[PDB]
C-alpha cells in the first residue's frame, strides 16, 4: 500500500535539491535555445499520472496485454487530435522521440544501403538526416545538400542531385535553417524520380499548427515531428501522413512496433493528447505569431550591431549568428552569455572551420521568451544585451552588468506563476 | 503560465479516461509479469519541470547550456545504478529496453553479423532476433530454445556457438521461468571469442535484492528496463563491468548521437529515485515475497491439472500451456479479464498459433506482491483462475469470481 504522500523531498534530498535548483534556473535564465520551451502544467500533470504503470504494446483495439480499455481511449484522443490539428488521415503517437519517429520512417520505407538525399548538418540538417555518427549515416548511403551563398536551399541544384543520384527518398526538414522550405517544390522533384518525400517538421510543428509556416503534410508521403519544440508539448515523437495507402500506414505502424520500439509511454501520450488540444486554442495562434515576430526583432538588432546572421534573416522561430569574422567559437560565446544568465547553444554554421563540439556560431530561438511574455520591445533589448556581451566577451564588468539586467526582467516575466 | 492549470476542468475527456485507469488499477488483479506499481516519488519526478530541458551529451560534455542541475540528476542515477548492481559503467539515457538493446547491437556489431539469441516462442524477447524486429532485420540470427524438460541445454548452445561462430551471444528472456547460468554462457562465449550480451529487464529487481544470479560480473554488457521487477519508471539502462575505455566509449556513442537525441531528464530523475528505493531492506524482502508467491501459484496450477512450462519457477513468472485444454491464450486472457483478473496471452514453446492468438498465458507476481498479497492470497487467486479456465463458458462462474476479486482488491488498495 504505497502512500500518495510519499514524496521526494523527505526521502531523497540530494535529488530533490537539484530538482528545485533547476526550477529556479528556469526562472532566472533567459532561455534562447530554439528547440526548448515551457510545457503547460497540464502536460506535466499527465506525465506524472498512474498511466506510467500500464504496458500496452500494439494499437488501440489490437493490444498484446489485457486491461487496455482506458489507455486505448487516451491513445485514440492523441491520434484524433493530431490528425485534426494537421489535416492528416493517419497519425502515430507512440514514437518515444524525434529520433525514434525518424528511425521508423527509414526502416519502413528503405532497405539498408539505399540512397537518401538529406540536408547536411552544418548547413542546418539534423543528425538523423544523414550524419555519419548517427544510425542514418551508418545504415544508408547519404548524399548531402546544403544552402546557397545567399543562405537558402537551391532547388535547382537539389533537382540536379536528385536526377544524378536517383535517391530512394528525399528528406526535407532542418534543425538550424531559418528560411521557408518549398514543400510542393520538393515533392515535384521527388515525383520526377519516383522517390519518397519525407519531411521532418519538428522545429516548425508549432508554427505550422498556427498556420504561420507552410504545412508539409499535403506534399510529403510521410511527416514526422517532435511534440516538445514549438508545439510546446511533452518530449515525444509523432508520425503524420495524408493520402497514403493502407499498406504504407501498415508499414509505418509496424516500423514503430514491433519494428523499433517496445511498449509506449502511455503517460507521455496522455500529455501529447492534452498539448495537442492546447495547440488548438486561438491564443496559441497569436502566440506563434509573436514568436516569429520576436525572432525578426532580434535579427534586426544583431545586424545593426555588425553581426553576421546566416541567410540574412529569419522566416521562422530561429536564426544563426556566424562568429567566424569575430574570432570567437560558439563554445566561447555560449559560455560568456551563460555567465550573464542568457542561455543559448553553440551551433555549427555553414562551412564551419570548427568541429560540432566547438563551432563558430550560436543558434537563437524565441519560442521560450515569447511563451514567457516577451514581445518585440523586450526582444530587441535582449538582443542588444547579447551583443554587448559578445562585444566585450572578456569584460567581466560588462557581463556582470547584463546579468543583473536579465535577473530583473526574468522577475517581471515569471515562467510558471 | 499559472500553476493552477489542470486537466480536469480543461479536458474532461482525457481526464475521465485517466481517472478510470486509476480505478481499473485498483479494481483489477494485475498478473502481467512485466508490470508493477511505481512509487508516487517516481511519478512526482516524471511530472517535474525537468521535462523542459534539452541536454544532449553527458554530464560535463553537453551540447546545450544550462545543464548544471540536470547534470547532477543524471550523475545521481548513474552512481546509484553502478552501486546497486556492482558495475563500473552505467548509461541511464536509453528511452526504453528496446533502445538500450539497440545501442548494444550497433555498438558491438556490424549489419549482417551473426548473433545467437533465444527464440521468442521459447521465452526470448522481440529484440533478441525476432524477424519482425530490427534485430532480425539487420543481423543474421541463429536461435536457441529450451529442452523438452523446459530448460536451456548449455550443451547444445555450445555446439551451436562452435558451429556458427556468432559474434555475440544473447542471454536474457521475457518468458523463461528458470535460472540462467551466466558464468556458463560466458565460458561458451570466450571459447569462440564472442560477446556475451545479457538483457536482464525482467529479473533486474530480483537481482538487485540478490534473489537471482547477477549477470553483471559475467557479461561484457548488460541491459535492463527500470519499470519491471525494479519497479521504477519506464526506461532503459546499460551496465557493464571490467570493460575498457574503448568499449564504454562505443556504448556512450551508440546511445548518443548513435540512436537517440535528447534524453528525458524528468524520467531520469525518476530512475534515480527508484534506484534508491531498490536499496531499501524492505525492497529485498519484497522480491523474496515475489518469488515466493510465484511458487505458490504454480503449485495450485499443477494440482489443478494445468501444464506449467519448465515444470516450475525460479523467478517472478511462469507460463501456462493451454494446448491440451483446447484453449487459445486470447480466449483465456479475455475470460480471466471479465473476472477482473488481468494477464496476457503468451506464445509457448512449439506454439501452433501465431503471437497474437497463442496457446498459453503468462503470469507474474510482482504487482500483487507489491500490493500486499502473500502465499495465502496467491494460492487462492491461482485457484479462482483455474475455476474460470475450467468453466470458461460459464458466465455464472466468471461473475462469482469477479465478486471475489473486487472484494480482495478492496482489502489491498494499491495507492492510498
Ligand atoms: N544543424 C544542427 N544543429 C543542431 C543539431 C543538429 O542535429 N543539427 N542538434 C540537434 O539536436 C544539436 C547539436 N547536436 C550535435 C550532436 C552531436 C554532433 C556530432 O557531430 N558529434 C560527433 C563529433 C563531435 C566533436 O566535435 O568532438 C561525435 O560525437 O562523434 C553534432 C551536433 C543542436 N544544434
Ligand atoms: N516470449 C515472449 N513473450 C512476450 C514478449 C516477447 O518479446 N517474448 N513481449 C514483449 O514485449 C510481449 C509479446 N509481444 C509480441 C509483439 C509482437 C509479436 C509478433 O511477432 N508480431 C508479428 C506477428 C503477429 C500476429 O500473430 O498477427 C507481427 O506483428 O508482424 C509477438 C510478441 C509479451 N510476451
UniProtKB/Swiss-Prot annotation, chain A:
(6S)-5,6,7,8-tetrahydrofolate binds at residues 121, 125-127, 355-357. One of its GO terms (cellular component) is cytosol. One of its GO terms (molecular function) is glycine hydroxymethyltransferase activity. It is found in: Cytoplasm. Pathway: One-carbon metabolism; tetrahydrofolate interconversion; Amino-acid biosynthesis; glycine biosynthesis; glycine from L-serine: step 1/1. It holds the Pfam family SHMT. Its EC number is 2.1.2.1. InterPro entries: PyrdxlP-dep_Trfase, PyrdxlP-dep_Trfase_major, PyrdxlP-dep_Trfase_small, Ser_HO-MeTrfase, Ser_HO-MeTrfase-like, Ser_HO-MeTrfase_PLP_BS, SHMT-like_dom. This is Serine hydroxymethyltransferase. The gene is glyA.
Amino acid at each position: 500500500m504505497l502512500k500518495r504522500e510519499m514524496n521526494i523531498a523527505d526521502y531523497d534530498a540530494e535529488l530533490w535539491q537539484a530538482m528545485e535548483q533547476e526550477k529556479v534556473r528556469q526562472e532566472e535564465h533567459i532561455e534562447l535555445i530554439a528547440s526548448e520551451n515551457y510545457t503547460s502544467p497540464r502536460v506535466m500533470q499527465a506525465q506524472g499520472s498512474q498511466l506510467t504503470n500500464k504496458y500496452a504494446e500494439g494499437y488501440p483495439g489490437k493490444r498484446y496485454f489485457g486491461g487496455c480499455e482506458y489507455v486505448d481511449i487516451v491513445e485514440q484522443l492523441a491520434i484524433d487530435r493530431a490528425k485534426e490539428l494537421f489535416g492528416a488521415d493517419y497519425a502515430n503517437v507512440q514514437p518515444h522521440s524525434g529520433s525514434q519517429a525518424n528511425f521508423a520512417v527509414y526502416t519502413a520505407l528503405l532497405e539498408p544501403g539505399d540512397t537518401v538525399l538529406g540536408m547536411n548538418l552544418a548547413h542546418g540538417g539534423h543528425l538523423t538526416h544523414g550524419s555519419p555518427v548517427n544510425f542514418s549515416g551508418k545504415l544508408y548511403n547519404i548524399v548531402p545538400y546544403g544552402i546557397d551563398a545567399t543562405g537558402h536551399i537551391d532547388y535547382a541544384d537539389l533537382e540536379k542531385q536528385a536526377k544524378e543520384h536517383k535517391p530512394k527518398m528525399i528528406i526535407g526538414g532542418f534543425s538550424a535553417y531559418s528560411g521557408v522550405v518549398d514543400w510542393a517544390k520538393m515533392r515535384e522533384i521527388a515525383d520526377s524520380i519516383g522517390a519518397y518525400l519525407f519531411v521532418d517538421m519538428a522545429h516548425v510543428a508549432g508554427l505550422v499548427a498556427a498556420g504561420v509556416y507552410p504545412n508539409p503534410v499535403p506534399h510529403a508521403h510521410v511527416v514526422t515531428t517532435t511534440t516538445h519544440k514549438t508545439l510546446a508539448g511533452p518530449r515525444g515523437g509523432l508520425i503524420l501522413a495524408k493520402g497514403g495507402s493502407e499498406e504504407l500506414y501498415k508499414k509505418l505502424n509496424s516500423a514503430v512496433f514491433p519494428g523499433g520500439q517496445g511498449g509506449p509511454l502511455m503517460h507521455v501520450i496522455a500529455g501529447k493528447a492534452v498539448a495537442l488540444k492546447e495547440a488548438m486554442e486561438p491564443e496559441f495562434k497569436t502566440y506563434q505569431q509573436q514568436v516569429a515576430k520576436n525572432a525578426k526583432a532580434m535579427v534586426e538588432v544583431f545586424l545593426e550591431r555588425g553581426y553576421k546572421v546566416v541567410s540574412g534573416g529569419t522566416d521562422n522561430h530561429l536564426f544563426l549568428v556566424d562568429l567566424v569574422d569575430k574570432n570567437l567559437t560558439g563554445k566561447e560565446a555560449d559560455a560568456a552569455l551563460g555567465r550573464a544568465n542568457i542561455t543559448v547553444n553553440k551551433n555549427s554554421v555553414p562551412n564551419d572551420p570548427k568541429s560540432p563540439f566547438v563551432t563558430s556560431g550560436i543558434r537563437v530561438g524565441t519560442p521560450a521568451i515569447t511563451r514567457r511574455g516577451f514581445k518585440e520591445a523586450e526582444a530587441k533589448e535582449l538582443a542588444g544585451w547579447m551583443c554587448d556581451v559578445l562585444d566585450s566577451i572578456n569584460d567581466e564588468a560588462v557581463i556582470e552588468r547584463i546579468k543583473g539586467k536579465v535577473l530583473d526582467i526574468c522577475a517581471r516575466y515569471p515562467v510558471y506563476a
